[PDB]
């Protein structure tokens, strides 16, 4: 239905009547299908900026009578349901947690024949760990009838086992505090149906029908519609034993009033018994409408079943009556979501979903919009209310109430509703709702916390990293489409904050990503959408870093082609702390050279003298590399600065070991001699000099290479935890910590995995832990290899040579002599 901004806003005020949930379901189990059906039924539409569909608004109204069946405060017969999108494959670990983290309820889809598949089982645990109330749906029932032609009782027994399996997981992993959260068909928390034909039902639906035909309060009618309850056709009495006084068998109630009607329609229709169909149909009061009347076979059955048991309603019924509202769940989820004091003024405001308290808005992800290459923040207001214009504290991942690091006191340009694919501006938005923000993209990379209290900690952060550690070279298979690749790459980078497309000096087009799979995906979308043109992709490669271990053996020297200019310098190491300080904004290229020097001098043991002579950082003008101007009395010096810097941006982006980036390289310019006339000191002359002197200084300062390393966090039942260590021990893995979730048998091992050893990791982890493990890895740090990159046989040298050949360079690494003046 269509709603006006007022309607939505008004609906968003009655949080007691909102449902934040997700759909846990394997893709091959109609996940997308069932989801759709809710959209095509209760999907909310507003009465030119497009976004990537992240959430869908659903509206559903119930009877005052129904509202009473809700065992949790409510108000009104209207309900707002926020169906938050989820990934297709489990591998997306990090973003699976993301969706769960902002949801309260969960529609778990299980298969009739196959039951609960491993992947779904895994996600469910995770859900449970965040304290998510499950609700089940046994999909693909049709296959049972049509293909397997199972009996009513066999099918019953199947559902029975299936529901049993689910509850084995539910009880084993849900929190004792939450209370029994197991699903019970008799309690209306389990639906059955088929996404394909588009039908589904709940015991509560047939209990409302047969409600009076037996003169019962549905409470007892649905209670009998499951388990061991029998209705003797002959005696016309309800019993609790599957046999009558004589010993003859009795059909279960479920099989009698639920599975039978359905089974007949299937048998009638699929057998084309035109004599029965009409009769059978009229009995269930299913009125075909003109054109439908002539249908037969699947075509017909599909129509009949939809009219009979609309799948969408069965599911919307369980979501409203059984899933928690943003008020019931925050009370017991708050402590888990607040990384601060469990009695903190905000943690309290979270429990109470208080719209009056200091803002506590959680940003789960950044979504691509059509409006430029800008991204809108997606998240949930756990406390207070967010409003357009409002100025908020944007607390990034590294923020801590103590310091001022990773903080951005800015103003929220606009607040918009994420109506699926379109946004709709709204003034404010009270706690308990999922909303979208405009104007944070340059403050928040992906995740973060927005507040108002100056003493507010962040909320359970989701580790993400923008460090390109895996990349490939893209080439068009047919040179004609070259311009179409040049555009898609531009497009690609525009859709994802963490993908990177750039051009090497060699002129190749590069695509670098956060990981094997994240890059994998990126490449697919490029060859299929952004470019749609056939491409030649090179094998995946790990991104290394070039660095020095000491001060240049001796002073480095180079002279321009004129032979009129000379640059003397020495390169020396930068301390990891300083490098980290740079990478993390503490030591910043845009600061005041004075203010910044004070920092380096004080907190990092740098001569304020050196630090005030920083000429530039690099690469891309902000990398963990620096040029200090230690020259003394060199006339015109300033006239060659822009060039020296320019030179530095290239020297640091593609070092001399094998073209990789430099890291932690301090270059100190000891002297400079220039031609008196400017004509002979232009970029054409100095840039090459500086560039070559740096290489010289670098190669003299004892060269080494750094490899990137991940920090994998793994969830896994104590039983399979074995397979974890098994695999880590074949990849140079280093366990950091292993802990167990208090109640459950769920361990959570954390380790360091070298990125150049992570290829096909998830795949191997899957075989090893029976599919029970749930990996989550992020970039953690750079590790300097001990071995000599210069020695071909060494372990680093092995990497280097291979790399150099790959790049078709001279197999051997250049001596410093090559770059030093050829004197």
């Amino acid at each position: 239905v269509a709603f006006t901004v007022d309607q939505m806003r008004s609906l968003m005020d009655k949080v007691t009547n909102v449902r934040n949930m997700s759909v846990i379901a394997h893709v091959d189990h109609g996940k997308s299908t069932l989801t759709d059906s809710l959209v095509q039924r209760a999907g909310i539409i507003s009465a030119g900026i497009t976004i990537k569909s992240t959430a869908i608004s659903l509206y559903s109204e119930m009877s005052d009578e129904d509202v009473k069946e809700i065992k949790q405060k409510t108000d009104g017969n209207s309900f707002l349901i926020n169906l938050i999108d989820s990934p297709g494959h489990v591998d997306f670990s990090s973003e699976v947690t993301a969706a769960l983290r902002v949801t309260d309820g969960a529609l778990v889809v299980v298969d009739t024949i196959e039951g609960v598949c491993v992947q779904t089982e895994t996600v469910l645990r995770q859900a449970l760990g965040e304290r998510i109330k499950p609700v089940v749906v046994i999909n693909k029932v049709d296959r049972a009838l049509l293909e397997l032609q199972v009996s009513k009782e066999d099918l019953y027994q199947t559902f029975a086992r299936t529901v049993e399996s689910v509850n084995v997981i539910v009880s084993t992993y849900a929190d004792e505090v939450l209370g029994d959260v197991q699903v019970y068909p008799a309690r209306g928390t389990v639906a059955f149906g088929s996404g394909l034909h588009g039908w589904a039902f709940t015991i509560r639906q047939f209990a409302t029908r047969y409600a009076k035909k037996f003169g019962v309060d549905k409470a007892k009618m649905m209670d009998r519609l499951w388990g061991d309850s029998f209705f003797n056709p002959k005696t016309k009495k309800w019993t609790n034993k599957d046999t009558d006084a004589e010993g003859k068998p009795l059909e279960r109630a479920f099989n009698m009033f639920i599975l039978d009607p359905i089974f007949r329609l299937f048998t009638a229709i699929m057998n084309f018994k035109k004599d029965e169909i009409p009769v059978l149909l009229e009995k269930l009061e299913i009125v075909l409408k003109g054109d439908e009347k002539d249908l037969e076979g699947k075509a017909l059955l599909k129509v009949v079943m939809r009219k009979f048991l609309p799948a969408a309603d069965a599911l919307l019924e369980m979501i409203v009556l059984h899933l928690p509202s943003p008020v019931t769940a925050q009370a017991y989820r708050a402590e888990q979501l607040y990384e601060g004091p469990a009695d903190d003024a905000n943690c309290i405001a979270i429990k109470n979903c208080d719209p009056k308290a200091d803002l506590m808005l959680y940003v789960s992800k950044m979504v691509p919009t059509s409006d430029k290459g800008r991204f809108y923040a997606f998240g949930r207001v756990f406390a207070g209310t967010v409003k357009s214009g409002q100025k908020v504290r944007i607390q990034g991942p590294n923020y801590v109430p103590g310091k001022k690091d990773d903080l951005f006191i800015k103003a929220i340009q606009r607040v918009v509703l994420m109506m699926g694919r379109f946004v709709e501006p709204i003034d404010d938005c009270p706690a308990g709702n999922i909303i979208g923000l405009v104007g944070i993209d340059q403050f928040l990379l992906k995740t973060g916390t927005l507040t108002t209290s100056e003493t507010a900690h962040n909320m359970k952060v989701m580790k993400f990293s923008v460090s390109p550690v895996v990349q490939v070279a893209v080439e068009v298979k047919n040179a004609n489409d070259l311009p179409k690749l040049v555009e898609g790459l531009k497009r690609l980078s525009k859709s994802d904050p963490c993908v990177l497309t750039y051009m090497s000096e060699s002129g190749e087009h590069i695509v670098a990503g956060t990981g094997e799979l994240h890059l994998e995906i990126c490449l697919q979308d490029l060859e299929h959408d952004h470019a749609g043109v056939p491409l030649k992709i090179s094998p995946p490669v790990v991104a290394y870093r070039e660095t020095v271990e000491s001060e240049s053996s001796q002073t480095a020297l180079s002279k321009s082609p004129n032979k009129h200019n000379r640059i003397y310098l020495k390169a020396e190491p930068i301390d990891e702390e300083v490098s980290l300080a740079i990478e993390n904004g503490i030591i910043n290229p845009r600061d005041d050279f004075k203010a910044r020097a004070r920092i380096m001098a004080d907190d990092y043991g740098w001569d304020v003298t050196d630090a005030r002579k920083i000429w530039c950082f690099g690469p891309d003008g902000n990398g963990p590399n620096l040029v200090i101007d230690q020259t003394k009395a060199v006339q015109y010096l300033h006239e060659i600065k822009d060039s020296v810097v320019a030179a530095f941006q290239w020297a640091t982006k593609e070092g001399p070991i094998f073209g990789e980036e430099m890291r932690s390289v301090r270059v100190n310019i000891l002297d400079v001699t220039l031609h008196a006339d400017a004509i002979h000191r232009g970029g054409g002359q100095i840039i090459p000099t500086m560039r070559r002197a740096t290489y010289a200084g670098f190669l003299l300062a004892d060269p080494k290479i750094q490899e990137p390393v991940f920090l994998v966090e793994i969830q896994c039942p104590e039983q399979a935890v074995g397979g974890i260590y098994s695999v880590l021990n074949k990849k140079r893995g280093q366990v950091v910590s292993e802990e167990q979730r208090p109640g459950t048998p769920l361990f959570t091992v954390k380790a360091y995995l070298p990125v150049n050893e992570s290829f096909g990791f998830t795949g191997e982890l899957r075989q090893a832990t029976g599919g029970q493990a749930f990996p989550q890895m992020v970039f953690d740090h750079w590790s300097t290899l001990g071995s000599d990159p210069l020695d071909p046989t060494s372990k680093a040298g092995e990497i280097v040579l291979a790399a150099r050949k790959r790049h078709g360079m001279k197999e051997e690494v250049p001596g410093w002599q090559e770059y030093y003046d050829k004197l």
Binding site: E505, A646, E818
Partner: protein, 207 residues
């Protein structure tokens, strides 16, 4: 066409496309067979190189008062090598490498090639070059070869008229993309290219 055969030739920072040593040997042999001789190397930027090889050498708005205007080249690839690169940065600040060109003239013009020991800038140079060529500078359908500067390597200056009658082709000697400004490393010169690189014997006395 004088480029031997084997697919379109272009200049790349990545190296010259489609130009093996063997191809060079064919194109050279064929240039001789049409009575052309090699007189030196010329190094310059990718864009320039392309132009010269496909469109030939062409003077364009010289300073008619510039008595030493001409097309400079060198017998020694090393001396030419030093000019094989951008002379000014691109907007981002990159100075990429260039290419090395092998200059050929119609053999029928060797009568115009002379040589001296004076360094082309020195006062005496002008007058002595003019004595050798038989007319006031600039050079025209003649060429002078002398020391780039005292003790330096030798450089050759074909006058514009002669220059526009050359036939230039790629060298199998690559510029280094990763060491722009370094000096050509003698070992990167193909032995086989070396073989076809002798210079004519220029005259020291006027005609």
């Amino acid at each position: 066409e004088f480029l031997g055969d084997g697919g379109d030739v272009s200049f790349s920072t990545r190296g010259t496309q489609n130009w093996t040593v063997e191809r060079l040997l064919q194109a050279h042999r064929q240039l001789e067979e049409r009575g052309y001789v090699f007189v030196g190397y010329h190094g310059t930027f990718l864009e320039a190189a392309q132009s010269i090889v496909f469109g030939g050498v062409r003077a364009r708005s010289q300073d008619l008062d510039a008595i030493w205007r001409g097309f400079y080249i060198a017998g020694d690839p090393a001396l030419a090598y030093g000019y094989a690169q951008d002379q000014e940065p691109d907007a981002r600040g990159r100075i990429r490498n260039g290419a090395l060109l092998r200059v050929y003239v119609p053999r029928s013009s060797l009568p115009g090639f002379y040589r001296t020991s004076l360094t082309l800038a020195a006062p005496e140079a002008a007058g002595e070059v003019e004595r050798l060529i038989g007319h006031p500078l600039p050079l025209r359908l003649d060429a002078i070869t002398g020391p780039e500067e005292e003790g330096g390597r030798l450089e050759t200056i074909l006058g514009w008229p002669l220059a526009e009658r050359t036939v230039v082709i790629p060298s199998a000697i690559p510029t280094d993309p990763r060491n722009v400004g370094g000096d050509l490393d003698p070992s990167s010169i193909p032995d086989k290219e070396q073989a076809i690189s002798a210079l004519p014997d220029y005259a020291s006395q006027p005609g």
